[PDB]
Amino acid sequence: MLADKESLIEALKLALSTEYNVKRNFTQSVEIILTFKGIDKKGDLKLREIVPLPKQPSKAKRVLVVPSSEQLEYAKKASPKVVITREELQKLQGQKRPVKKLARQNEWFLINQESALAGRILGPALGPRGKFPTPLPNTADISEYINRFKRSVLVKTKDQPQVQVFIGTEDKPEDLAENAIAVLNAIENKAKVETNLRNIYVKTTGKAVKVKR
Amino acid sequence: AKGIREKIKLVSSAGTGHFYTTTKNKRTKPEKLELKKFDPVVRQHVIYKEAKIK
RNA sequence: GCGGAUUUAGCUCAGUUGGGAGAGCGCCAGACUGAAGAUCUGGAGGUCCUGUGUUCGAUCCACAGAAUUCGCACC
RNA sequence: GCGGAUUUAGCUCAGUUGGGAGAGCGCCAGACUGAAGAUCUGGAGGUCCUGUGUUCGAUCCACAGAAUUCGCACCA
RNA sequence: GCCUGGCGGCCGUAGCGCGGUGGUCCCACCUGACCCCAUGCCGAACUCAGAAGUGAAACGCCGUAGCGCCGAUGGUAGUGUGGGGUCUCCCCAUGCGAGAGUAGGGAACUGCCAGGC
RNA sequence: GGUUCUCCCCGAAAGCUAUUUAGGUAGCGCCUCGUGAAUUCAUCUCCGGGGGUAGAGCACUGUUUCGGCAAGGGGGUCAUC
RNA sequence: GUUUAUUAAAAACACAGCACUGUGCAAACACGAAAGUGGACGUAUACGGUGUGACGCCUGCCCGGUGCCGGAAGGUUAAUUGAUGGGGUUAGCGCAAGCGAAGCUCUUGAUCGAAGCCCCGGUAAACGGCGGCCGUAACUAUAACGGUCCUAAGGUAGCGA
RNA sequence: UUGAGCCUUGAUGUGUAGGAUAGGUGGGAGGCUUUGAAGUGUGGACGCCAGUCUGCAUGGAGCCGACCUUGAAAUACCACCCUUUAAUGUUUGAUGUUCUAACGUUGACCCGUAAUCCGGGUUGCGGACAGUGUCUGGUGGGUAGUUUGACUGGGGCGGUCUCCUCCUAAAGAGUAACGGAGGAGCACGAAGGUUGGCUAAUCCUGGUCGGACAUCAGGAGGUUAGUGCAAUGGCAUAAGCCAGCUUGACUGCGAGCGUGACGGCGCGAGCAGGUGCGAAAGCAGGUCAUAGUGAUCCGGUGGUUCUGAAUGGAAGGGCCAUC
Secondary structure, eight states: OOOOHHHHHHHHHHHTSTTTSOOSSSOOEEEEEEEESSOOTTSTTOOOOOEEOSSOOSSOOOEEEEOOHHHHHHHHHSOOSEEOOTTGGGGGTTOHHHHHHHHHHOOEEEEOTTOTTHHHHSHHHHTTTTOEEEEOOOSSOOHHHHHHHTTEEOOOOSSSSEEEEEEEETTOHHHHHHHHHHHHHHHHHHSOOGGGEEEEEEEOSSOEEOOOO | OOSSSSEEOOOEEOSSSOOEEOOOEESSSOSSOOOBOOOTTOSOOOOBOTTTOO
């Protein structure tokens, strides 16, 4: 195995202190970090694993969206972190600043299939750091699929030595371990290579933890 | 088991019901060459990796 | 009697998956010698015991026979 | 078979910047010889042990496998 | 009595030869056919269709002593059940018989159910 | 190695299986003494056919030999073995 | 000679030299549980190994195997000494399933590692040891002369039962 | 001198482009701001030039960064990570190198002593040496031990109980001989199945690539056939065969019994389920079978609802894998 849930709960209990959670201004986040050993270019050990958290925290995930007119008034109630119409992509051609912006300060980009401009313009400034869109369903009754991507993280390594993602906030380490172990089941099912681990930590707004395993 | 060109035991757990057995295959000829559908719970013939995984 | 070895190039015997038949050496040419050998490069030299079978292919094995030969069986 | 190592010319073996893949002894041959050995110098020389995956490009990086091999397990 | 079809009783008189006749009935060939089915190639072998045509045959009989095969009455092996004998086990007083051999023997037999002179 | 007074009927003790066996060993009896019991068990008269002790053939493979030729094979000779 | 009285009556061999060997010395031997008494009232020319076969010469020769031991250039892989990995007993962490830190420990053949010996080297008294078939002298055939075989190897330092 | 941890002190880097000296690995979009706290401008001095030192500006101006430009790859701001190794501190093992109150005095001097034992000190000597307790090693026949089957036309050899066949040997059953022929120490990645399919040759005659031969169409229609090691025997509605479709060789019990001596070794009415095999009738414990191991006692090992001297967990047992 990678690890199990008591191993992580027992380390999260420490990551959320005044010693480790060195606070600036607001309610900050917690992170799972996992580092490998024999990892090279072959293919056996590449991920993506889009993991919609078991127990969503105090701070939700930063989802843009792109609807069509009929399902648009559902999605308008449904708390997307921003919206642009399937239409108004026509107007965004050559707007470098917005493109780089949106790729900088959102995390997910859910599109009705009619949006076929978003495939072209946005790649160049999203891909080198590695975050992604998906084809949204076309229906009116759409909330829980917005909420899906408003709660979800990606297991990013296509070629690099280590994987590290947001997993919770300051309030409760126990529900937050149940978040971390769902990431770890998705990994061990994809990259069946186990002893190629270097280390497994957790981490904050800054300082990391040397988890008991 | 004692020799080399000899008939050997390969430890054989089922695909669904845990239960394991053994008897006879051979290191004389190429080894990549079996799996099977039988069931020691008898309920449904489905899957059996043998001792061997083909 | 049984069980082994052996009948493979002048000499000495190597070799066998079971598809090629070997070299130390003697001859032959080649040239160096008038010549010959050394040494030399080239080339060659065969009852591969016979019979039957197994086999893709038996010099080889298995089996029947022949023959040289050895250890023991005998006191 | 537990873990490292190696396999690159006939045999010992370089191969570590991933961009030309080769040296040594020997073999061939010429020069030389009176003919060989020697000495000099050209030529010859491959399942890069296997096959992929990754790469613009793979002996090379990685994985799985076989053999050679070193130490090794053991009170069915 | 005569002829056919189907299925038995039949473990070899329950095996061949030479021929000579038979049918739009029985089979069947034969001549079509992607098929059903697919020859790991062919309908040759089962088939599916049945037109058109005759018995090449398939299949049956009738004549038949070429070749297997059949066989009395009797004699005999040799021997249990005995008594006596007695170079290599005989000869009687009995239980009964394969073969040598001779008269002499040939192409079997029998049924069930439908349909035809 | 030896039955230390009498008597009477059943009663071969003395072997089928072996045995890092050697007058040595596991159960055993065709045995009695006490329980339990049926046409139980056997020779015959018979029913029904596998045996193959005999015995007899030349069918088979293995073959005697005399006849008769079965492109088999020889002798004699022409010839280039 | 008188020495094995007991088969032989010596036809046994006790001499005695010496290369080599055990001791630089509380020596070699230990018998007695504590002796230091043989050797010692003494030194490696004192006393013991294994012998020797008068005397005197003469010990040629040849290291395959196999001994005698010695050594270290070097591998087989140990009491010595413990990389690590897997466990146990258990705090912490788990409504449960169960994870899981020290410490205490179990269990590694981590790694060095030659007694033997691969080996390296000296031994002639250590253990034994002299191959065959093919061809031959003005005759027999003597058996001097000969090619070879991966055989470890052909009667020799003598006098002829 | 040389080995184990450990940063207290150091340090192994120049190429273009980016007004500019770019280890990698990550987060996101901000970070510093009390005047004695920060840069930023510009002088001056050391030189293994890849370090820095030392003077003076100014300082709530807005300055570093996604935000505008560059590239082989970003940079502001917090995370992450210490080693191949040196100088020392602070933690500590070893081997050499020796001095030496251990020690032994079987060496003297002194000494109790007209003293061989023997008491004890100055001294002299070597020296952690000695002493043995087990562990690893062969080294020798320097105690003791044993004589380990039997088969014997009496022995030494050559044969067998094995577990097999045919011969020999008197039919239920058997009964050897240094006697006759010959022998298991094994066997499937299929020598696996249930429907289906039947007919193989020699030699005669033909015909691309010969020179006995290999798919054939035909003979005559012979029941003149093939057996991948050893062998006997199968026997043709073929098992040899061989293509499609694919690997059931069910979990569990059994009336009936074959019977035998504790193992055992054989098979089946019928009953449960559902377990697969086919339309159906219905059919069945896999290599042609013969030759293929444990008296069994001590072992070991792996899972449990079976337990365990007051319990609870739990040794060790029970069930049976696994040998």
